[PDB]
Amino acid sequence: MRLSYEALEWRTPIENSTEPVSLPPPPPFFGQERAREALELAIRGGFHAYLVGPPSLGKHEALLAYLSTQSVETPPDLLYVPLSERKVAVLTLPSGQE
């Protein structure tokens, strides 16, 4: 049967096209709670995760912002020590001791 205009009108009505909105920034991965939970589990457990999503979705920016939100113990100052004129190894020392 023929669809009426009201049954077809999908656009959300506009209260006013003025009065610039003032909204707080949303949490990272807003609407992507599945990915947020997976990445939280990965951060807590120290695992290796992989972000899957359709291209051009903001995965990189959202992930970088969320990881900036995170915190961790100060990473030890890693460096290269020559075990010999031939042999080198990566030595990790507490910060500042380098």
């Binding site: 997976a38 972000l51 359709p54």
Partner: protein
């Protein structure tokens, strides 16, 4: 030891290393990376000309690598069991978020965080466009950078303020920048090069809706002709026989052929042969969205039923005679409305689309205004019976019915083959 430069892995220690699946499976460093992960084998690479090289002792890895990529970027990397054992956590981003006022508010806050200036109407229009991108009335597209690009376009079209008018201007400009192909198609239809009928009633001709490839998909009608001739059952798909029809197109043809075989039983095998061709096609056909159009055209050809050419018919059909949902319904409806407007709206042209696609009907402003004014219709059906009832303008059940006429046409074809056999035997 003083001439080793730290890589990404070295400065990722204690933190996180973000990498892209493309940059791994493309540059061939995936194997070396997974050996550095599993075995702690990080080796500062050297050119082959090197006369000597430092023996770098294997280093236990403290970083947490987080690969980022598309599903296609990882299905080509999931085949390695080392990947599935190294990367246990799968963070999937939903392509579409639910359409909720909270989601719209979150989108507005995200846009404001970028540095934009949203009005309430501008945010509403951007949120509606995001819903349209997802092709769902209850889901909004999650690709935030697409919405950000549209916001930048609207901002430079509105001086820096994302007004609803500015967003509409950006949408119209983006549509017009890729409108050359559709403009040429419209000119060809107007000139008579591609003969289409948006008025009148023709037997066995249906304006199928076709979505073209390339930058944003434009729908456009494609005339479909079905011709019924006596003969042993053979529903010929001319576009598939020629090799243009794809696998799914052939599946649709076979599906509707089986529906026709099993629906009309009061003879032996289907006593007619039906030829289905997209006129002025000249291009490979892929997908099952013209199944309903093919079925109604074949039924009209069988029953000699003149079909209202003003209505375009889309939608797949199963072999029990029920219309199935199809994709890019917005593109199809808008393209048919574009062609009808180019030829001049007759006040009765419309589109017959599956009832299952109502949640996908996010039509543009002009199409909705035409529907409100009654200059354009949108019919929704779930069975092909209703679609043919709409097109032929009659009812299947009832005397002088469409079903009775189709039965009479099949009977006439069978009697003609019968008379041919009578002449053969006598």
């Amino acid at each position: 030891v003083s001439l080793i430069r730290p890589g990404a892995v070295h400065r990722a220690q204690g933190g996180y290393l973000i990498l892209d699946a493309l940059s791994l499976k493309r540059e061939g460093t995936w194997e070396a990376f997974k050996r550095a992960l599993r075995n702690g084998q990080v080796e500062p690479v050297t050119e082959p000309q090197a006369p000597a090289g430092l023996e770098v002792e294997p280093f236990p890895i403290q970083m947490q690598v987080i690969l980022v990529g598309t599903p296609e970027a990882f299905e080509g990397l999931e085949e390695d069991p080392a990947f599935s054992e190294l990367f246990r956590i799968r963070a999937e981003f939903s392509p579409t978020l639910p359409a909720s006022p909270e989601n719209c508010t979150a989108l507005g806050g995200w846009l404001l965080a970028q540095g934009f200036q949203l009005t309430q109407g501008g945010l509403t229009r951007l949120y509606d466009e995001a819903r349209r991108m997802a092709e769902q009335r209850d889901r909004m597209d999650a690709r935030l950078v697409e919405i950000r690009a549209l916001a930048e376009e609207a901002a430079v079209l509105g001086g820096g303020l994302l007004t609803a008018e500015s967003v509409e201007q950006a949408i119209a400009a983006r549509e017009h920048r890729s409108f050359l192909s559709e403009e040429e198609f419209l000119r060809a239809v107007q000139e008579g090069v591609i003969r289409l009928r948006t008025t009148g009633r023709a037997v066995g001709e249906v304006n199928s809706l076709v979505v073209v490839e390339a930058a944003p998909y434009w729908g456009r009608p494609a005339r479909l002709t079905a011709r019924a001739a006596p003969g042993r059952d053979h529903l010929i798909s001319i576009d598939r026989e020629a090799g243009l029809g794809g696998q799914i197109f052939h599946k649709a043809v076979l599906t509707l052929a089986g529906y026709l075989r099993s629906r009309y039983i009061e003879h032996g095998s289907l006593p007619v042969t039906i030829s289905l061709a997209f006129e002025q096609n000249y291009v490979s056909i892929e997908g099952d969205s013209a199944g309903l159009a093919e079925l109604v055209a074949a039924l009209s050809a069988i029953g000699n039923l003149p079909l209202r050419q003003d209505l375009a018919v889309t939608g797949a059909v199963d072999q029990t005679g029920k219309v199935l949902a199809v994709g890019a319904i917005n593109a199809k409806v808008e393209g048919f409305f574009r062609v009808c407007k180019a030829l001049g709206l007759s006040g009765t042209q419309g589109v017959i689309l599956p009832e299952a696609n109502l949640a996908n009907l996010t039509l543009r402003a002009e199409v909705l205004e035409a529907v409100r004014a009654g200059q354009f219709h949108i019919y929704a059906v779930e069975t092909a019976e209703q679609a043919l009832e709409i097109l032929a303008g009659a009812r299947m059940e009832g005397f002088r019915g469409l079903q009775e006429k189709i039965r009479a046409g099949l009977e006439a074809f069978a009697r003609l083959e019968e008379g041919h056999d009578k002449e053969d035997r006598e």
